[PDB]
């Protein structure tokens, strides 16, 4: 009958509510609509209730974060009751379905780092750009301390606000550091779209010639490959491998979360970076690949086949299959939690 | 005709387009909708094209920032083509109509500060809160320097993301500091709501959050000059009423106060008789600033104008600014911040 308002609700909005069994109760006032649906997992038709309102209770929804839409007369729009997130190439509603007994991505009373917005003009794209830079707890007070850096990228249809919002990255990293499971580190989150209008080679040039120099001159970093990592989800995973594998002198740790390498002579990929497997293994401290067990087959296969080629070649790596999750943010929160614990050790 | 895609459009979205005369062409794919409207100043009915997109060209829209909505069958929602902003008590679409020959809120090749997110847990509300804090360009370079602080508040139906987003505050402040028109300063932007933990513009709980939590936190975590001659509070609409309520009842902590389309409502006994003695009061306060758009709804315009008149009747020194041609909308507040910041800490 009555549940708990989702944590993604706008302040003051009672609905949607999460009921027992993780069913979700949606309501909306729409007296003149012909049809009202909610698309969460599948599409559900709402039914008319009192005072022009419509409502529906869904089937159980899998735990985690989900983009969703309300459909008015078949038009997919943001639910006025929920926060929005930049995903699926627009501002989309999202809903959080809590995991029982899991709290690593939740806020805790531990020392907190700070996410900073840094603006810069790109001479590659000829546009103003923006990075978000997480500094770990104590950064401002520990002026003699220098830190390793993780460059962390969002997926297709997302932007630089993804990891701070959908990814809950500050809680994940703050909590790992506070528990002694990860080293204090700076995390840099930029935009995976870069078009050079004078012509992804453009994104690589932005990272190598603009973002890395910006972070290394504005923050107290340990500016060497043994203290520099790159990872991303989906498209950002393909970009992390493209950029790191063609700039291996700058990175010793690389991660792809539901993304990474499009596979011919696999031994020649990235300009012969791993033509000699034993030498490549000596140069890289970590290669990490993950995928949800419930991802769409085409997305699962691309990443799994990359892993399979690494296994065949003897390229050392960590491979994680996230049980019960799909091409959605819980898979990526779990991946960051695992990956960050392995970094800079 | 030739149109310019608005800067608030999602990347890749051609519409909405700004046409000559600042008319706006809106378009949405909705083949099975019964009615599609756009609410921008007033409601316009859009008209369905053969293939199921609906379109309308508005009347000329006044320059500045505007919240807007698409209505499908009377349901107000976000336009899929635009960015969203927290305003009108939800996530709402916004559109930017550029001003000819004005660039103080645009990004320039000047030294840039940073806006950072700081989290803190409030004992008053028993909830996690967050502030956005602007630090000026040489903050990390000049560790022997400390800075004055402006506490800057959003309006009703908004939140702490308002000044960084709708308000373009980092461009405004970066540019003023770079040109030598404002002193280097820290700006703290928090949330104007403080809900009682047992729940299910005067707010004693919000005052306690600022006085007992936000100000001490900022003075401890940042290199501030922690005294009233280097502490200011201002806000727009609801936040302007809050700035006056909090500053006037904690005058030993603030010497500069601003209300942008806010501050208002006998008069001589307001804020526990703070201005009983006007001559002493004028010597205690270094700046009182009030602004209003000339085109604001009458109840809002007259509220601020009447507050100004009461100051004129009492002999209370202040700056009063009318923003020409703008209403109860963000361009009024960008102009107000630009003026107020130039006056601070002098
Ligand atoms: C969970 O959300 C976040 O972490 C936000 C971080 C953030 C930091 C600085 C900004 O100027 C900003 O602008 C909206 C956002
Ligand atoms: C700047 O003034 C404001 O923001 C609002 C003023 C205001 C005035 C009269 C009212 O009856 C009212 O409530 C409907 C509000
Ligand atoms: Cl208000």
Author numbering:
A (entry chain B): 295 to 493, 508 to 571, 575 to 656
B (entry chain A): 295 to 494, 506 to 570, 576 to 656
Report text from the authors:
To assess the role of each catalytic domain of the multicatalytic DmCE1B, the separate domains were also produced: DmCE1B_nt (45.3 kDa), comprising the N-terminal CE1 domain and the CBM48 domain, and DmCE1B_ct (43.3 kDa) comprising the CBM48 domain and the C-terminal CE1 domain. Comparison to other CE1 family members enables annotation of the catalytic triad in DmCE1B_ct (Ser542, His638, Glu606), which is found in a groove between the CE1 and CBM48 domains.
To investigate potential ligand binding in DmCE1B_ct, we pursued a protein–ligand complex by soaking crystals with methyl ferulate (MFA). This disulfide bridge was absent in the structure of the apo protein, which was crystallized at a lower pH (pH 5 versus pH 8 for the complex) but may be biologically relevant to stabilize the dimer formation. The second MFA molecule is found on the edge of the active site groove positioned with its methyl ester ∼5 Å from the proposed catalytic center between the catalytic serine and the oxyanion hole. The MFA in DmCE1B_ct makes no direct electrostatic interactions with the protein and is not positioned in line for catalytic cleavage. This is not greatly surprising since the enzyme lacked appreciable activity on MFA. In DmCE1B_ct, the positioning of MFA further away from the catalytic center is possibly due to the smaller loop corresponding to the β-clamp or helical region.
